[PDB]
Amino acid sequence: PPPTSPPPSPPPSPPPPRPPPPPPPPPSPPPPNRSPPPPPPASSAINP
Ligand SMILES: *[C@H]1O[C@H](CO)[C@H](O)[C@H](O)[C@H]1O
Ligand SMILES: *[C@H]1O[C@H](CO)[C@H](O)[C@H](O)[C@H]1O
Ligand SMILES: *[C@H]1O[C@H](CO)[C@H](O)[C@H](O)[C@H]1O
Ligand SMILES: *[C@H]1O[C@H](CO)[C@H](O)[C@H](O)[C@H]1O
Ligand SMILES: *[C@H]1O[C@H](CO)[C@H](O)[C@H](O)[C@H]1O
């Protein structure tokens, strides 16, 4: 007899485990230091 046909081929292997997740970004930098107010106008003279 002719050589018997080979057994069926196995189904495709499963995909490797999917990668882990990224890490949360470092704390966002604080706001800019707001500048101070301006000095009051030159005051008048004290009462006599
Ligand atoms: C698979 O091939 C063989 C020959 O190698 C044979 O013809 C079988 O009948 C067939 O199923
Ligand atoms: C798929 O694999 C089988 C053996 O498992 C055989 O070689 C077939 O010829 C091939 O198509
Ligand atoms: C991955 O699995 C299939 C069967 O699901 C087969 O065995 C391969 O040889 C293997 O790499
Ligand atoms: C402030 O910066 C961090 C990273 O430095 C992150 O992107 C925040 O989303 C942002 O608000
Ligand atoms: C006033 O000072 C702050 C820093 O405290 C900053 O440089 C502002 O740009 C400036 O106007």
TrEMBL record:
Alpha-D-galactose 22 binds at N33, S35. Alpha-D-galactose 23 binds at R34, S35. The modification 4-hydroxyproline is found at residues 1-3, 6-8, 10-12, 14-17, 19-27, 29-32, 36-41. Alpha-D-galactose 2 binds at S28. Alpha-D-galactose 20 binds at P7, P8, S9. Alpha-D-galactose 18 binds at P3, T4, S5. Alpha-D-galactose 24 binds at S35. Alpha-D-galactose 19 binds at P3, S5. Alpha-D-galactose 21 binds at P11, S13. It comes from the Eukaryota. This is Tyrosine-protein kinase ephrin type A/B receptor-like domain-containing protein. It comes from Chlamydomonas reinhardtii (Chlamydomonas smithii). The chain holds residues 1892 to 1939 of 1987 of the full protein.
